[PDB]
Amino acid sequence: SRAEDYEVLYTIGTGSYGRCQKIRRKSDGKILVWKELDYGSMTEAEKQMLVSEVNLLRELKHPNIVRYYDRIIDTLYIVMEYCEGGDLASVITKGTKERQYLDEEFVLRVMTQLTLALKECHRRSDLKPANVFLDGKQNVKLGDFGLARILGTPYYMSPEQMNRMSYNEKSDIWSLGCLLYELCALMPPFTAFSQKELAGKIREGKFRRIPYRYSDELNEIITRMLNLKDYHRPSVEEILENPLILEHHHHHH
Numbered sequence: 001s002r003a004e005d006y007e008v009l010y011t012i013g014t015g016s017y018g019r020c021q022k023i024r025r026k027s028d029g030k031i032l033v034w035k036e037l038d039y040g041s042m043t044e045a046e047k048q049m050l051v052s053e054v055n056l057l058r059e060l061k062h063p064n065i066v067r068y069y070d071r072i073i074d075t076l077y078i079v080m081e082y083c084e085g086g087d088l089a090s091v092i093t094k095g096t097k098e099r100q101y102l103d104e105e106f107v108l109r110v111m112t113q114l115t116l117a118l119k120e121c122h123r124r125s126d127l128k129p130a131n132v133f134l135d136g137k138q139n140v141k142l143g144d145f146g147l148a149r150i151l152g153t154p155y156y157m158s159p160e161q162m163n164r165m166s167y168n169e170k171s172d173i174w175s176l177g178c179l180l181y182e183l184c185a186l187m188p189p190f191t192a193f194s195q196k197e198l199a200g201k202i203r204e205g206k207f208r209r210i211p212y213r214y215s216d217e218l219n220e221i222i223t224r225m226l227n228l229k230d231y232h233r234p235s236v237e238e239i240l241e242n243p244l245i246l247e248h249h250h251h252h253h
């Protein structure tokens, strides 16, 4: 409701949208974040979209989706859950930098927890590592797609989107496979110097196996999600039935 109820601790990041800050709530010392957005420069036509988007973010309370808390108008402040471990893109960047592949156990947590985020998203009815967040307790959280909207280049561009087919939930499984693959290989499954060259790679359907430190079973599941035919990809339910996925891979709060 009011910005005087929150103590600004520090700036986490910045962008063309505005600023991301870590904040402590005066109520009960709750550590959260806000996105600081200047609307003063925008037209009403863009303001009609933005207001419709802030309220749409109020809908999903889920352990594996970043949680909305509050909105303030002063500048617009969108008050979100704090994710101590930051985003997945930085984890990948750090892996590359330190020459260190991620533990299979971490990859299984991401797979389990994002698949559950997707199960929920699909019930309501762009999975990039930059839009996936980690708390301090091994939990994985999907960023609100509506939040990311208001805030070969694509790589995760499913054959359906490409072949001008309408979107389906199996397209999200494809994007999940690309993310989990990149998490294992520290590179996306398909890469090229042009977008039409990227399209050629994706449609051919071929990629390197994930590093040999990952089990045959993990490799099998990622590979399955990267099938060209949407009907050969596993459903959310089929993914979670996988023997690899255990209680300890789920959220714990």
Ligand SMILES: CNC(=O)c1c(C)[nH]c(/C=C2\C(=O)Nc3ccc(Cl)cc32)c1C
Residues within 6 Å of the ligand: 012, 013, 033, 066, 080, 081, 082, 083, 084, 085, 086, 087, 090, 133, 143, 147, 148
């Ligand atoms: C290097 N990045 C960080 O350390 C980092 C940290 C500690 N938190 C974040 C990001 C978020 C964070 O902590 N809460 C969030 C809620 C929504 C969105 Cl879109 C992002 C965040 C980031 C990117």
